Amino acid sequence: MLKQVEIFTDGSCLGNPGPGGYGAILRYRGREKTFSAGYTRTTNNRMELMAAIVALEALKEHCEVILSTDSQYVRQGITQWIHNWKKRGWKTADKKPVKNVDLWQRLDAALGQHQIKWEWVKGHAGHPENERCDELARAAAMNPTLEDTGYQVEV
Numbered sequence: 563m564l565k566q567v568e569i570f571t572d573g574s575c576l577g578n579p580g581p582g583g584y585g586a587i588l589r590y591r592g593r594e595k596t597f598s599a600g601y602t603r604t605t606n607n608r609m610e611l612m613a614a615i616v617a618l619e620a621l622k623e624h625c626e627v628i629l630s631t632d633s634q635y636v637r638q639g640i641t642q643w644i645h646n647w648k649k650r651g652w653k654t655a656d657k658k659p660v661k662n663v664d665l666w667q668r669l670d671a672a673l674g675q676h677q678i679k680w681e682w683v684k685g686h687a688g689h690p691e692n693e694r695c696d697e698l699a700r701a702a703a704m705n706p707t708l709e710d711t712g713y714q715v716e717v
């Protein structure tokens with residue numbers, strides 16, 4: 563076995579677009595790290611991605627990760643852009659840039675460090691840690707301090 567870690571993530575947004583935030587918990591050997599940050603203008607989907615990126619980027623060795631989230635958006639890109647069909651050159655069928663590619667590329671880079679088991683949670687009652695990530699993300703959205711510099715009204 564490698565170092566075994568559990569990651570829980572969620573993102574939230576008060577508008578579409580509007581102030582949003584992410585929350586993540588990383589747990590290894592009974593010790594816990596929490597990550598959260600709030601953005602003045604973003605989307606729910608970008609916050610769900612950022613939560614997974616930040617937690618994975620915090621790992622400093624090759625780990626076996628169990629990554630638990632309720633994000634359907636995160637699942638879509640795992641199935642479409644970030645593992646399968648990277649042959650498409652980061653283009654759609656009509657040869658166009660994919661939405662949120664800045665974050666999808668950071669997620670792809672972070673995932674390549676680890677063995678990953680996904681736990682796609684059915685909404686809530688998955689774990690208290692998922693509920694805690696939802697609280698972290700909403701708390702940050704209510705107190706935004708950064709710009710989401712990669713969010714454009716147009717990409």
Ligand SMILES: [Mg+2]
Nearest residue numbers: 572573574606
């Ligand atoms: Mg959400």
Ligand SMILES: [Mg+2]
Nearest residue numbers: 572573574696
């Ligand atoms: Mg949420």
